[PDB]
């Protein structure tokens, strides 16, 4: 099992492109903030989660998203070795809601 | 007379600073979108208006603002020589309602 | 909400045009000068605001405005691409008052 | 006992309807935001309350309400089932103060 459902606000301009092999992809960052109850305590959960929406199916849906847009994404997480060398945890969207 | 009342969604994270004398400054960008009536016509009004909130009494609500926050700002407009050529217009907040 | 009320002295004469359908409209630049308040102290405010006046039933009051005319314009603002290719703030006049 | 007095800003443009029976109603959403003392602490109270104004005689007090109108609504609350399936709280307005 690998399923993450996360809501947040797009905090970085959506980078749209198509792979040299014809794969449409949209990348952006999702900023999440919430109050969480853990072991009886109230703590804040926060993260700026990189999100990638690949494939023709979800490309149109993203057109409505820009910096400031609030969305809820469902997909799987996976780690990637960025150019910075460090490891980058990113959410591969399978589903996206615009409100 | 100089008074602008503009609503929108913060499209750029607030930048905070304190001048040498101690006056706090909070700057962000407000993106506005709406359909207006001009003598009887469609007209899609849009702009990304820079906003600065200066001074002690007014900085509090500022911390409750983040990218995606929906707000309405009331203040005066003024132009500052940006970096390029012509000046850049800024909305100097006098009142801010978190929505 | 999108409402700006701005007083000033016209610094660029009205340029008149007729839309493809016959609707008259003109544009001039309004130079605003004032002293406002910020952080508990006076702050200078200035801007040369482009103003568009559209519609048959609104051109009348503009025939009296020329360079040096002092007026107050009420309307909504929007961003348009200048020839330069740079975005420029413009006040679409809804109401105009002389002197 | 069922009375709610709530100040706020109309965050949803009014939707006007006429039921098949001929009864009119005006629906909108009132966004409230305030600080309330509680247990020795100042807490932020917030909500987007759906408001319904029903009947011919109650429509007049809604002529001026638009997004941005700041008003205080007094009425009673009741729970209705929304088309999404969930049951939401609604404030049936009896009085509306136009704070201007």
Swiss-Prot record, chain D:
An intersubunit disulfide bond is seen in some crystals. One of its GO terms (cellular component) is pre-primosome complex. Changing residue 43 to A: No longer interacts with PriA, still dimerizes and binds ssDNA, altered binding to DnaT, does not load DnaB replicative helicase. Does not complement a priB deletion in a priA300 mutant in vivo. One of its GO terms (biological process) is plasmid maintenance. Keywords: Disulfide bond, DNA replication, DNA-binding, Primosome, RNA-binding. Disulfide bonds join 47-79. Induction: Induced by hydroxyurea. One of its GO terms (molecular function) is single-stranded DNA binding. PROSITE patterns: SSB (PS50935). Residues 1-100 form the SSB domain. A motif (L45 loop) lies at residues 81-88. SUPFAM superfamilies: Nucleic acid-binding proteins (SSF50249). Disruption phenotype: Called priB302; no growth phenotype, 2-fold decrease in recombination proficiency. Inviable at 10 ng/ml ciprofloxacin. Resumption of DNA synthesis after arrest of DNA replication (upon UV treatment) is slower than wild-type, no change in survival after UV treatment. A double priB-priC deletion causes a drastic reduction in cell growth and/or viability. Strongly reduced UV resistance and greatly increased SOS induction; when associated with 'R-230', 'Y-479' or to a lesser extent 'P-557' in priA. Synthetically lethal in combination with a polA, priC, rep or lexA deletion. The keyword RNA-binding applies. Involved in the restart of stalled replication forks, which reloads the replicative helicase (DnaB) on sites other than the origin of replication; the PriA-PriB pathway is the major replication restart pathway. There are several restart pathways, the PriA-PriB pathway is subdivided into 2 distinct pathways. priB and priC have redundant roles in the cell. During primosome assembly it facilitates complex formation between PriA and DnaT on DNA; stabilizes PriA on DNA, presumably by preventing or inhibiting PriA DNA translocation activity. Genetic interactions among priB, dam, lexA, nagC, polA, rdgB, rdgB, rep and uup link the PriA-PriB replication restart pathway to DNA double-strand break repair. Displays high structural similarity to the ssDNA-binding domains of single-stranded binding protein (SSB). Unlike SSB binds ssDNA in a shallow groove on its surface where DNA contacts both monomers. The L45 loop (residues 82-89) plays a significant role in ssDNA binding. PriB's binding sites for PriA, DnaT and ssDNA overlap on the surface of PriB. Homodimer. Primosome assembly occurs via a 'hand-off' mechanism. PriA binds to replication forks, subsequently PriB then DnaT bind; DnaT then displaces ssDNA to generate the helicase loading substrate, which allows DnaC to load helicase DnaB onto the fork. ssDNA is displaced from the PriB-ssDNA complex by DnaT. In a PriA-PriB-replication fork structure, movement of the PriA CRR domain exposes a surface to which PriB binds and contacts ssDNA emerging from the PriA pore. Binds PriA; binding is improved in the presence of ssDNA. Belongs to the PriB family. This is Replication restart protein PriB.
């Amino acid at each position: 099992t690998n399923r993450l459902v996360l809501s947040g606000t797009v905090c970085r301009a959506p980078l749209r492109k198509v792979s040299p092999s014809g794969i449409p992809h949209c990348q952006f960052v999702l900023e999440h903030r919430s109050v969480q109850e853990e072991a009886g305590f109230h703590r804040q959960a926060w993260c700026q989660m990189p999100v990638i929406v690949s494939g023709h199916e979800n490309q149109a849906i993203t057109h409505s998203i820009t910096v400031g847009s609030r969305i809820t994404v469902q997909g799987f997480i996976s780690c990637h070795k960025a150019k910075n060398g460090l490891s980058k945890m990113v959410l591969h969207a399978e589903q996206i809601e615009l409100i």
